[PDB]
Write a protein that binds this ligand. Sequence first.
Ligand SMILES: Nc1ncnc2c1ncn2[C@@H]1O[C@H](COP(=O)(O)O)[C@@H](O)[C@H]1O
Ligand SMILES: [Mn+2]
Ligand SMILES: [Mn+2]
Ligand SMILES: [Zn+2]
Lengths: 229, 747, 620, 165
Amino acid sequence: TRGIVRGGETLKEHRDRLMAATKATGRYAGLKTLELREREPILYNKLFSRLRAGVVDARETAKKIAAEGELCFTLYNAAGDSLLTSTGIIIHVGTMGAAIKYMIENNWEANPGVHDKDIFCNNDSLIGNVHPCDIHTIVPIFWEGELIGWVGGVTHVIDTGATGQVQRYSITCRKVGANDTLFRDWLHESQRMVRTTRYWMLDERTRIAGCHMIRKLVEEVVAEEGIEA
Amino acid sequence: TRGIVRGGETLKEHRDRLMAATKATGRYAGLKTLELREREPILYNKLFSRLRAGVVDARETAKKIAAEGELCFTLYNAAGDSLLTSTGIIIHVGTMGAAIKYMIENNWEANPGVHDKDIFCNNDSLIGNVHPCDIHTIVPIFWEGELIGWVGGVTHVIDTGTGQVQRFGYSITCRKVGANDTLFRDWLHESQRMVRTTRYWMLDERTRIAGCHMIRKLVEEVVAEEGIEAYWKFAYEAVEHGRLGLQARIKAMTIPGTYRQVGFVDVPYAHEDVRVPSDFAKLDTIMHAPCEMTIRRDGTWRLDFEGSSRWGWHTYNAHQVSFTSGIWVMMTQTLIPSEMINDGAAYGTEFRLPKGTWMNPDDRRVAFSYSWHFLVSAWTALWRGLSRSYFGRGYLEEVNAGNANTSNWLQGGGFNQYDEIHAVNSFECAANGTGATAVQDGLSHAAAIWNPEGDMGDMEIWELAEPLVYLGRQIKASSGGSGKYRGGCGFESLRMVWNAKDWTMFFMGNGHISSDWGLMGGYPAASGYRFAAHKTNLKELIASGAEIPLGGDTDPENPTWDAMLPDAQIKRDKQAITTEEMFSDYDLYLNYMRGGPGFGDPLDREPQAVADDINGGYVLERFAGEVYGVVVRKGADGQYGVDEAGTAAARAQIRKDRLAKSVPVSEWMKGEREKILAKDAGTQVRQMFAASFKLGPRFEKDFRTFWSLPDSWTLPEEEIGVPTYGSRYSMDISELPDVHTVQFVEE
Amino acid sequence: GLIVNRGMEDFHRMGRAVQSHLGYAYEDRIHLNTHRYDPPLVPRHLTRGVVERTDMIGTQVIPLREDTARDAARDLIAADAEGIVISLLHSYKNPENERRVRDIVLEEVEKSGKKIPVFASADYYPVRKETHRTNTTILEGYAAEPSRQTLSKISNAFKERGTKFDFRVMATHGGTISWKAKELARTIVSGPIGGVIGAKYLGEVLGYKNIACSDIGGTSFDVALITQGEMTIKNDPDMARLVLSLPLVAMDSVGAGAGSFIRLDPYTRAIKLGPDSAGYRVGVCWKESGIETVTISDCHMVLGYLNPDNFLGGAVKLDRQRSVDAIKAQIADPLGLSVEDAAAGVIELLDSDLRDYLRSMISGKGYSPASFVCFSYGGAGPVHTYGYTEGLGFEDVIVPAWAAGFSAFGCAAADFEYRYDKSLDINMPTETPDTDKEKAAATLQAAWEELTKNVLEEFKLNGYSADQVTLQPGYRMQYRGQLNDLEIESPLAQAHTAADWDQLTDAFNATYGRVYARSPELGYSVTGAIMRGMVPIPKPKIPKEPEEGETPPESAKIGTRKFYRKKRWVDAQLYHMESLRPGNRVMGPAVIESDATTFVVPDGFETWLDGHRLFHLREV
Amino acid sequence: AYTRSKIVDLVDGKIDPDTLHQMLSTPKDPERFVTYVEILQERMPWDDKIILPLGPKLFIVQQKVSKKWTVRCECGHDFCDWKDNWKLSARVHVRDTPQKMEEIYPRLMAPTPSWQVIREYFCPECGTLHDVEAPTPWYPVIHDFSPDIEGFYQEWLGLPVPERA
Ligand SMILES: Nc1ncnc2c1ncn2[C@@H]1O[C@H](COP(=O)(O)O)[C@@H](O)[C@H]1O
Ligand SMILES: [Mn+2]
Ligand SMILES: [Mn+2]
Ligand SMILES: [Zn+2]
């Protein structure tokens, strides 16, 4: 299966299919019936209740890496569509989802490539973001070598830069880490966008910690309740 | 081997060793002898010749992607030291060298790692760079798995991203933008948002990577034919060679001793036409760049800038890397005009840039977008210092009073005659006047300090790039510094806005102060001023056959254009720096390029040279008698001629008038001292001194001693009545953790 | 005299600033105090201005004020101007104003009764860049007629000794013209561009499409490339420290010839060649010449490449011992080398400089030397051919038997061809309606017609009618945004339809791919139209002898000489070049001598002579 | 080396361009200084040995009798000891008003006296302008050059140092 998405589809082939089914049927992904919800209700309510709780857990746990509320985490499917969102202000569900759909449409799969344990960062103005200082961390979730979803973590950094501005710091879905390790040139380069180093560094450690917690959550849920479900 | 450098040293173990040997011996890498050069002269000469020739070929071949500028390429050894630089402006040899030395001192080797076929990009503000838009591409060179050097390529992108005052208005810190000779897509998409037009940034990246990879192959072929053993010696002997070359030139052309000079330039940010958003930034300030030059018997020399002024809320500050790296574009024009120029010269020169000054701010808020304004104003004084050595030794041909301020930078923005974004400006300030020589006049409209190959450009080419039309292009009368030999005159061009939409323009250059000085009797070049006309009603004036402004502003004390434009809003003043201002079709913009300083007593100038200057438009008739003492008479053919007898009497009369109106320096001093004690001077003067004292204790002591001032007298900046934000509270770079900057300078 | 736009009277005398440092070596270019302005062609007191402005697309922003043109004309006439040049901005696009001033000047000249020629730049060099154009147009009103007198005498000197023909002169674009042509600024070329025309001439005969020319003289090293039968033209060159508007055959100078001086830097001890040369005076081996600094020729003496007794057939008495003495003191002893290793070392550096420049020059065009043949000519060419061709992999290395006069042979091989150029600015998307393609063809066609008039008028004054002239239309086209160095020979004599335009675009995509990564998507631009007109003339006939045995006649052997190379002294067999027969082979070490040339063939090399009397150098 | 007459023309600014280009582009002649000072010595109205020129008409001289080194004007006026700044013993004219400025510059092209001032330092005897400073108000008088004559003659020129008192 060449495409990284589960089944062999590429990210764009996958979303393109789902979007064509949505436009045609008036129902997301062309789902005229919800087999899992109707035939396995308990298991269906269990996945949501458990994922929702595990996501909330990641947000509140990571929150203890400073001392905000704009902090928030979201779980996406492979196509960049929100399934669940942690406690917090939900302005950034679409902005981060748009960052995911940007990587899908602009062939991030071939370059710089989307691999397991990769760390992405984004705040791009042209992709769309509420504030220039609201920084996104996006991690892909894999299962048995195939991509099954994304995690997005956002924080409002208080000490960035830029007066009486009249016209337009841009991070365009940059791969800032691999093997769950951040690149030094990215860390040094980021400490020049900010006035004080503390807030930027703890916020990134917070976002990543929460993303990885949600990644482990999915891996654990999938393992216990099966990837089919 | 463990480390990636040839031999098994890490990049830092390797450099630290060379730097330790450089300190203990005074010779780069502790090379008391250059075995390759001495034992194998031909192979050594051939290594430079081929490498120099291949580095130039890369620059010219890669250049062929246009529709030359700051374009340049440099070959470095493993420690980040330059060996050879291509044709072009060499101000970036040290900036890119610093970028390599930054990766070395911050363990890039471990993360993100330095591998063959990697591509690094950089323009960092804190590492050191002349302009934010000057983008570096750096490629490592490997031989049989081990690193043996680096390649650097730089361009000046012309369409990247009003009234900046703080740095927080782009930055690339040695980012790994590619691997396996292939650029990363996230970098391509991200860097095209850092720019208003895509075409210029994209081609420039191709060019840099092309030249780099050519030079990379160029080294791999040289090392293959001549062997790695030979090249490895050359990559360190060539640097120690450059040091010896500079030392030999000093001992041969100059004189040992101490030379003292200073330079100034204005920053008039109090004027309403300087629309800066920060109110603490709106004040008049003056740049203070004193320099004590020490040339030593052993051929070493020292440039100490003790006493300089503090950095300010503006874009004219500089970096210690930017100051020292760029000072050699000037030095290679007089002392060391050599194609062997490399970092060896740097190791033969001592720089002291006091921490906190405008040339070494050590504060992260500082902006440096237009460093040239200060740099060209501070470097010119060094011409005069060196010239004293040339003059005393007898090499008068090398004497030069100094470089003109590279000013009026015509800048415009909006939509051009093609209904497209403006990107290319004229850039006529590449041809300013040059300083006078001890032998002959200076060259008019001929060069800039950062490029002696001055090119003015064709009017017909600029009108294809700008929505402007030339109504005049003329030599700037009386812009050259008066003297026995006249400083080179600038020139001027009158622009009319034509087929521009959403158009804006601003002026950029020295105004109240002439940065350059004349030498040994010569006078400074003319200072700058602004002329612009809005709502001119020129369309109706042209149609009706009325008087229309043409040519240049011959005599701004008696202008002829203003009366021709009665309905116009005319701005004519000394405000040579403004922020973006709205312009529209049929408005006027005078682009005035500065002249160079003069040399010698003006009334020693041969009278026929004065008459030739009036007829040639280099000097307004008025000053022929007042400045030079020459009596000229208009003839039948309209040309001016010399009145031999009348001149002799005028020269003899001026000499008596000089002795009459003059005063003994002892007398004048006590009068100036009363003004100092009463603190009688503009705020800009007091702020300059107050800030210069705090950063330069040795300067304050000399000032107090010279003027015999009591300790009771103090000049606290906080009591002048102007904003002083940033004078006592700072944002050091030491606050940033995990960041190790390298010191090329005493402070 | 000179009439330009009012308010811009100075742009000529300002020399665009660049003219203060044209023709300088690198170290002089950066050494500011070396810069110097030559006096302007036209002084300020003979320059006047008319009130007028036409923008880049021909729009008249400021209509011409004709009374300012009459006063300007009257002033220059009153100053007794022996010629009036007119150059207004963008007159190449809309010459209406410039040609009206022209008519006004002509009128005021008539009224005066004085003979004063008038030169409108739009009538002579209608191309962009006012400094290039005005300089070139001034040469017509400044140096043309005086040079006719100069060459009338040269042609007369030959007539009164036998010649029964009119001499032709070389022009920048590679073609030859009459010495009394309407535009003689094109004869300002003095370099050896003939060598490139000669090599291209031989190429057509021998089927060599890719030639790398190397003219090694006593005063210059010159190189150039003929790629796919066509040579490169530089359209805005600089000559005589003047920016000009003349199509010039492109050559690259690499040094100052075999007469280049050899010095050691006083600060660096680096071996430095040139930039100045002894030229005619050979070197210090010529006692009577007064040269005191060693030259590359002196190195050839020490190394035994040149014959002391046979320099120019023995007209120059050279003493090798002087070369041995001067190289010992100036180069060898300071470097701790022997006199032989020093001389050998210099030649080694020079060979690598030439080698690198040819390799990179070929590589810059997108080729490898394996696709190219190298022509090594000039008096000193055959002396280094082995050196700067080693291991490059040229398909073939050739040394013409007439190498010493190959450049002059090329001037004879050039066509009797006039050329005229005009600037254009056609902008065309890939996909447009035939209406826009018809207008594009009309613009280019109208230019071809105005140029044809100039070409044919040049020939009529030479006695040739239009039916005798072969016209070759041309144009400079490129993909929008991508500059190139190509000139396209139009496949059509004229163009009118939208299908004729597509034929011109395809003609470019064909030549482009034939020389080289195309980008037809961005569209096309036409920045200039070209018109060339040729008349048949007698060209030098190529020898075509039957080849004989491969052993040279014993009478061709003329002794032996020892030369030093690879740290070894070697006994070389001397041969008399013109005694060698086609088919003959010569094994190295050997030195094939002529009266004005020396072809060195060290051991490890071999050369054979063909029926065309061309030597082929191989590496065995 | 260059002919003495050629160096004379350099001193007078009558040198031709070809030789002037040679001097700039070719190795410097070490004998320049000795020839240079000898030419200047031959045109002084006094016979005190020049040891270093400081300007077209300003030199450090060896007083014939006392052997003390002093700064001296071409007309013969002694300013001070060679270690001291000659300007402190000269006469000055400061252009600190627009009126003064506009005598040497056109208006608008003239520096603004409240930012920059022109200091004209003259010889008290002949009224020769030996140097012009262009600093800010209050700025000290500049001591332009402190030559190391001993090391210059001895280490570089290979000459004996003149006698000094
Ligand atoms: N027999 C020869 N006679 C005269 N010059 C020669 C001879 N052989 C080689 N030359 C070289 O050819 C140069 C002149 O070539 P050219 O400038 O083309 O006339 C001389 O300076 C020598 O380097
Ligand atoms: Mn926010
Ligand atoms: Mn730049
Ligand atoms: Zn005096």
